[PDB]
Design a protein around this nucleic acid. Structure first.
Lengths: 171, 104, 53, 141, 141, 98, 65
RNA sequence: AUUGACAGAUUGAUAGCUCUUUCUCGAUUCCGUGGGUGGUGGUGCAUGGCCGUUCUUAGUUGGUGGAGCGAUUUGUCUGGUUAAUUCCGAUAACGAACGAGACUCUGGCAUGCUAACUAGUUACGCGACCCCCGAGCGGUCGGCGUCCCCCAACUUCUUAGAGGGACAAGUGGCGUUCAGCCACCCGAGAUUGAGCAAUAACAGGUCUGUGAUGCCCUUAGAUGUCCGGGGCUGCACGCGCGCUACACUGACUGGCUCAGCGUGUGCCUACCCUACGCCGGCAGGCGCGGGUAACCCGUUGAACCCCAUUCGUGAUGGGGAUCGGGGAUUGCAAUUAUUCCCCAUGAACGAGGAAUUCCCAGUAAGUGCGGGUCAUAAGCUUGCGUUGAUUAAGUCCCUGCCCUUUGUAC
């Protein structure tokens, strides 16, 4: 009530919250095309933006799933009634999102399309989307039961340096 | 009323925090009164060193995960309505703003 | 019945677990993280920590 | 109008600030003269500038010094740098530049440390060893 | 001349002698038997040590005020041989510091200040700074 | 249809009152966060929801030892049957959008 | 015993001099700021290096091709 | 149907676990079968992810063209150059990609700028308090503690912004007068130290970090789970990283006197840092305060060091193992000694054979203090400073690594 926790501790706890919510959204809206959360606190309100491709699906029928998710978030993180609101925004250039593409590939692999061909197409999609380049690695037991790895690559890529931080979107 | 209102901008990001700080000074100059320039506090470094390894059996190598945290606090000699107009602007980043009433 | 969980679970590494894995070894207690050191490494970027030096 | 000059010396983490003023040449560190400070074997150090330039150069300039940080030796090397530096800064501003230049020359030929501060600072330890460069012992067998 | 103008070692010797000559301190019963801190293998070889450290406390109080018992233990701290384990800090004896501070209180050297902790008083400033002057006027050496 | 009636039936009503419901995967909580009429703990809650899920009258997601039970339409119809509720009812998903 | 220039320096300097021979001169700090003006050099150090090689090429040009 | 029970016998138990004997939710149950579910069970030689290593060196790659029946090769190199497949230059190659470099953080220069009651204050003003505080007959000075706010003055020290700042840029050599190397001026002299880090691997480690996970096993007399107790600490012995030492360049007893990273309660499940006052030899106890922190702890009054002590080369006052008796705290519980204090006991060890580790500048080494774990808490670790060397500035002898030619029955 009148706590005002440490400036150190508060920032750590905030990031922790942000990270848990990211997981849960990834776990819940996996198939649905989730591409990140962008949270921001305000006076007596905490906006939280879901980024995704299939926005119609995340919202649900007539306004349903978003309302369920707000209620669940309220219940879980100790938020008052009407202190939080989920805002689904459509992702511009979904190809350049790495986690969205990694999901798309997961889906394709689950359906039963060949390990190569689905992964190749995904690669072709991200390069049409307008990237500097790419690196797509599938690994594990690709036929037989001795684990191998695919490694489909193209274009301009970087590994070293600081720049990797902000120049490669990894997933 | 006029009273010694204190803004306190704390953040993880530097550039974003300084931009906010600058905009609040601009807003204070516009609706002229006073300022007592944005006081850089000594930044803290929230630091965690862990083993890179899950398990024990590599060569023993360590991460040094930092997290910096900055505090720019700004004094002001004004009424409340002007402060609410200023502080409502300069939001969207992770800059935590804490407005104290007077003295302490 | 009444003795089922009746053992002092107030202190030491019985009580405190991680807030993600829930295994009770190598918890980053500092700054109230309370998470597995492996878990911490996993999430650190989201939390705001970053390897600069 | 008074002739004030506040100049600092440094050594590792010893910020010794010597403050010159138009006076009678006392020269005291924190709150005491140069005949204590009290590592004492290093008295001729904190004396050196005065011994080189003489009492005639100092004569009309009282110097109050304040020190903090560092350890005993580092503090002495800080004050020694600072009082000499302060003297030079006084002569630059409130005397004449040819006089300063002469003082500077007399100091440097003795030691460049008197004006120029060492950049040397404690190197950071890295995991896999007890210090910066030394490693923990390897077992092999 | 103040106390800072005097070589602090030979000051506390003179203050101790002063406190003996006065003969109205309040050395408690233990003195002989006590250890002096958990540091120490032995007790002091100087058998009238209480007077010496009383003097040392007073002079500390002159130089830095607001010094509580805890603060007096911290200043009289040192190495603690664990013997076969490595050494650490240990704070000095509380009770002896407290008895010293209460003894000075009875003398009216000192007085418990506002905002906690001891400070020495004018009548105490007398004796401390008087004996400084005596030491200064001992000889040119 | 199981166990202490007062507890179970209170869980069901709380699940109906909101669209969703959550727990923590922590067996030993003689209270439960929210709810808290009389002990009515974690477990009973958690075991009811798993029973619901098995017969196909609630969905799931887990995420960091915590559970998230989104409720189905067929599930809603099961709860209304259990609690002999009227046909209007309004569970939670009413909410004016704009 | 160390500092050789990489091709990312060398190419940029040659390209600078090919287009802006006239602006560039022997004094390093003048053309250090020229290099800032005429070219978007992202880092300070790289800029500073390029200008250093630009000066060195100028000196070679002032003594045959 | 057949969930849940005071006795009393039994039991470790106040486990309604059982035998005994009264009653209970009242739609729970029990029995199959399908089938779950759990598992710090098995399998890292079924995998994922993450590390580690090869491999911290300079290496790796495809398009098109050329050479070969082809595997392949060229590019990717005779030569100089560089820390570098870094450059210069050669040229059946051409024009590219990664890595290296650039980059990010850090270190050190800014009497330059922007900045301040959560920095200093800084020197003033001394407006003073203040008592003889001292010098001094008295004035004027010396010194702090502070009493200080704000309508004193600022940023030297302080915090941290965004700028600048060094580039091999100058002078001299050496070098195809290229790439570059050496010196010296100015001044940090390209070099402060980290972080990031390719291709292809390994059947490296990890299923005991995961509600990442295949299959296998087990699944109510459980390998599930919880409670009590014990164990992981057991000692003919062998090895590995450590601490303490073997003293007088020391020990002890006083005295004097300088740090820097941090961290800290009001919490994810029950509690922090602690000033000051008394009581206690000591560990500690009891009172009151301050502190979600440049505010309080805190001028963090650290150690070594420095200065007076005694002791006198004696297994000595060096060393502090072992062990007896007592006293404190943490805890639900400390016996197989949890830690801490006290008195007593006083072992080997007089510098370590063959072996072999680590290191070149604020480094090694000494020296303490933070953080981690943590109720209790470091002989470990990961950071921090404080004191501060010798010797190198080279070479392939050993051990390895990189390229080229070569030989090869691998």
């Amino acid at each position: 009530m009148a706590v005002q926790i440490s400036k150190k501790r508060k920032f750590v706890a905030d990031g922790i919250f942000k990270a848990e919510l990211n997981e849960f959204l990834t776990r819940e809206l996996a198939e649905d095309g989730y591409s990140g959360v962008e949270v921001r606190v305000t006076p007596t309100r905490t906006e939280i933006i879901i980024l995704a491709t299939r926005t119609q699906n995340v919202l649900g029928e007539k306004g349903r799933r978003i309302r369920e998710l707000t209620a669940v978030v309220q219940k879980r993180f100790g938020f008052p009634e009407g202190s939080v609101e989920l805002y689904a925004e459509k992702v511009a250039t979904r190809g350049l999102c790495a986690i969205a593409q990694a999901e798309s590939l997961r889906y394709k692999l689950l359906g039963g399309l060949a390990v190569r061909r689905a992964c190749y197409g995904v690669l072709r999609f991200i390069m049409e989307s307008g990237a500097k380049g790419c690196e797509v690695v599938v690994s594990g037991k690709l036929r037989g039961q001795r684990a191998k790895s695919m490694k489909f690559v193209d274009g301009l890529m970087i590994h070293s340096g600081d720049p990797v931080n902000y120049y490669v979107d990894t997933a | 009323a006029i009273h010694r209102i204190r803004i306190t901008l704390t953040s993880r990001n530097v550039k974003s925090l300084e931009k906010v700080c600058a905009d609040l000074i601009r807003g204070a100059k516009e609706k002229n009164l006073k300022v007592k320039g944005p006081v850089r506090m000594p930044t803290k470094t929230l630091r965690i060193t862990t083993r890179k390894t899950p398990c024990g059996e590599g060569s023993k190598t360590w991460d040094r995960f930092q997290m910096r945290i900055h505090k720019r606090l700004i004094d002001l000699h004004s009424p409340s309505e002007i402060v609410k107009q200023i502080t409502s602007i300069s939001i969207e980043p992770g800059v935590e703003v804490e407005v104290t009433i007077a003295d302490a | 019945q009444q003795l089922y969980w009746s053992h002092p679970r107030k202190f030491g590494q019985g009580s405190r677990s991680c807030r993600v894995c829930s295994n009770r070894h190598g918890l980053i207690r500092k700054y109230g993280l309370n998470m597995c050191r492996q878990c911490f490494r996993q999430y650190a970027k989201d939390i705001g920590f970053i390897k600069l030096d | 109008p008074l002739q004030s000059v506040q100049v600092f010396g440094r050594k590792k983490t010893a910020t010794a600030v010597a403050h010159c003023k138009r006076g009678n040449g006392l020269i005291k560190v924190n709150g005491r003269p140069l005949e204590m400070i009290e590592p004492r074997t290093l008295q001729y150090k904190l004396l050196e500038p005065v011994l080189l330039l003489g009492k005639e150069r100092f004569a009309g300039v009282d110097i109050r010094v304040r020190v903090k940080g560092g350890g005993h030796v580092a503090q002495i090397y800080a004050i020694r740098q600072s009082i000499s530096k302060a003297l030079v800064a006084y002569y630059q501003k409130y005397v004449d530049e040819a006089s300063k230049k002469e003082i500077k020359d007399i100091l440097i030929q003795y030691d460049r440390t008197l004006l120029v501060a060492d950049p040397r600072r404690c190197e950071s330890k890295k995991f896999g060893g007890p210090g910066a460069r030394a490693r923990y012992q390897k077992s092999y067998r | 001349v103040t106390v800072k103008d005097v070589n602090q070692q030979e000051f506390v010797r003179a203050l101790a002698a002063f406190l003996k000559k006065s003969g109205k301190l309040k050395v408690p019963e233990w003195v002989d038997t006590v250890k002096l801190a958990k540091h120490k293998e032995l007790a002091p070889y100087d058998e009238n040590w209480f007077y010496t450290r009383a003097a040392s406390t007073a002079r500390h109080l002159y130089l830095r005020g607001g010094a509580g018992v805890g603060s007096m233990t911290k200043i009289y701290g040192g190495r603690q041989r664990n013997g076969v384990m490595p050494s650490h800090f240990s704070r000095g004896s509380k009770s002896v510091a407290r008895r010293v501070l209460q003894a000075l209180e009875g003398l009216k050297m000192v007085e418990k200040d506002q905002d906690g902790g001891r400070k020495l008083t004018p009548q105490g400033q007398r004796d401390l700074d008087r004996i400084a002057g005596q030491v200064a006027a001992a000889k040119k050496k | 249809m199981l166990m202490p009636k007062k507890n179970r039936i209170a869980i069901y009503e709380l699940l109906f009152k909101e669209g969703v419901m959550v727990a923590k995967k922590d067996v030993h909580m003689p209270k439960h966060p929210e709810l808290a009429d009389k002990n009515v703990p974690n477990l009973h809650v958690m075991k009811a929801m798993q029973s619901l899920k098995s017969r196909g009258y609630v969905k799931e997601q887990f995420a960091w030892r915590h559970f998230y039970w989104y409720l189905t339409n067929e599930g809603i119809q099961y709860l209304r049957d259990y609690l002999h509720l009227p046909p209007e009812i309004v569970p939670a998903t009413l909410r004016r959008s704009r | 015993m160390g500092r050789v220039r990489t091709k990312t320096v060398k190419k940029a300097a040659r390209v600078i001099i090919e287009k802006y021979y006239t602006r560039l001169g022997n004094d390093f700090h003048t053309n250090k700021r020229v290099c800032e003006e005429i070219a978007i050099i992202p880092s300070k150090k790289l800029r500073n290096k390029i200008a250093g090689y630009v000066t060195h090429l100028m000196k070679r040009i002032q003594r045959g091709p």
